[PDB]
């Protein structure tokens, strides 16, 4: 029965303003309240506010006063917030709950990425391996916004398999590793490539790695 | 200010159908004026939204197994788990909405208990690809460990490096309950042309002492 349905990623620059929504379904939408969260890595889990559809009255975190607002449209049974100046502090998860009542669960979640950064492809570089088990890898570097993805061998090979996060470069790109652990004598006779594709630039390469 | 929720552990390690007990102390009462004291229970697993196991207390949420139980009172609570599932592996969060504002615990993470495994550590130098293009990366890779504690040093010709260089870490393997780490050096062409020795030296429980893997450019 109850859901809420958020609206998906947003990639916005500084001084920007987004609105997320969040279309409920499957109680008396007028009849409970409706809470905002935020969750980033600096602050953990916050409070953001509430509103009372009812009559539109609502109840701010005084830290978001101002920045965040809270509205609904009963039409279309949707709760509404909006972010205005935004900084890369605003970089965040945000999710919209019901209340306890009707189960209280959360949307999915919200994901606001701030930056100035424009789309952009990786380079591929090799980690190429030099007793029993070697290691070798992908080294994608220098693309936005997320994600990429790396699959080695065509998706073949994906025993000892690791694809770490994304970190964030102080350029405002991305960077991430991919590797693998595979048996040492394999190597000359095996051929390793990983297949890596970045969606957004439309970036698809594949790499092979060798010593 | 706000009321502060303090939990601890901050990590809890078990072993599956284990007994986990977690607990969140409340900086203010958090009882309310009507009887009722709101101090709620999430479980957020990796890459999903907080799910509420209990709330205003004790009240299990209709559907949430009988395993999880709340107790406590006024200011000192604790989440019970009788027989810990890998259902149940993520991020337990507290919360308190007695009080506005209403805030949330930093959490505390259940995981899978393992014996000491030391890591597998592999450093690569940059490609001379990437050399062309006028950057370089350096790469210390540390695979299969446990526990998750490692600490990672960057040494350019016996200089410390600090600040230059980002970590990245994979979620507890599915299998063998271990993590990996990836750790990135950046540095110029030309700086990493005017150095020979870089080394990666890893610290870990799991070893008699610090392993060094280096190469000479």
Redesign the interface.
């Known amino acids: 029965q109850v859901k809420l349905q958020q609206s998906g990623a947003e990639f916005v620059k500084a001084g920007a303003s987004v609105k997320l929504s969040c279309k409920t379904s499957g109680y008396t939408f007028n009849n409970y309240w409706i809470?905002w969260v935020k969750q980033s890595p600096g602050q953990?889990?916050?409070?953001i506010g509430e509103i009372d559809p009812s009559d539109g009255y609502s109840?701010y975190?005084?830290?978001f006063k101002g920045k965040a607002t809270l509205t609904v449209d009963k039409s279309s049974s949707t709760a509404y917030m909006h972010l205005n100046s935004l900084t890369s502090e605003d970089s965040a998860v945000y999710?919209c709950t019901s209340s306890?009542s009707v189960?209280?669960?959360?949307?999915?979640?919200t994901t606001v990425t701030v930056s100035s950064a424009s789309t952009k492809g990786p380079?591929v570089?090799?980690?190429?391996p030099s007793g029993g088990?070697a290691?070798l890898?992908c080294?994608v570097?220098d693309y936005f916004p997320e994600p990429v993805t790396v699959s080695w061998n065509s998706g073949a090979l994906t025993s000892g398999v690791?694809?770490?996060?994304?970190?964030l470069?102080s350029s405002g790109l991305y960077?991430?590793?991919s590797?693998v652990?595979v048996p040492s004598s394999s190597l000359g006779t095996q051929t390793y490539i990983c297949n890596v594709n970045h969606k957004p630039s439309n970036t698809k390469v594949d790499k092979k790695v060798e010593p | 200010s706000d009321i502060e929720l303090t939990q601890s552990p901050l990590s809890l390690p078990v072993s599956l159908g284990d007994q986990a007990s977690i607990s969140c102390t409340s900086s203010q009462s958090l009882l309310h004026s009507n009887g009722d004291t709101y101090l709620h229970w999430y479980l957020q697993k990796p890459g999903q939204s907080p799910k509420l196991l209990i709330y205003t207390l004790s009240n299990r949420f209709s559907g949430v197994p009988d395993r999880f139980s709340g107790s406590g009172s006024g200011t000192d609570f604790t989440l019970k788990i009788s027989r810990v599932e890998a259902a149940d592996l993520g991020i337990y969060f507290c919360s308190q909405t007695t009080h506005v504002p209403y805030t949330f615990g930093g959490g505390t993470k259940l995981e899978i208990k393992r014996a000491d495994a030391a890591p597998s550590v592999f450093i690569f130098p940059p490609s001379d690809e990437q050399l062309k293009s006028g950057t370089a990366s350096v790469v210390c890779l540390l695979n299969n460990f446990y526990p998750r504690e490692a600490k990672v040093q960057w040494k350019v010709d016996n200089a410390l490096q600090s600040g230059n260089s980002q970590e990245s870490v994979t979620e507890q393997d599915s299998k063998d309950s271990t993590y990996s780490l990836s750790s990135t050096l950046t540095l110029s062409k030309a700086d990493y042309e005017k150095h020979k020795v870089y080394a990666c030296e890893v610290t870990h429980q799991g070893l008699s002492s610090p392993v060094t893997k280096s190469f000479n450019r």
């Open positions: 809470h953990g889990l916050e409070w109840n975190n005084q830290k999710y306890t189960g209280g669960s959360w949307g999915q979640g380079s570089f090799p980690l190429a088990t290691a890898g080294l570097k690791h694809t770490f996060p994304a970190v470069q960077s991430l590793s590797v652990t």
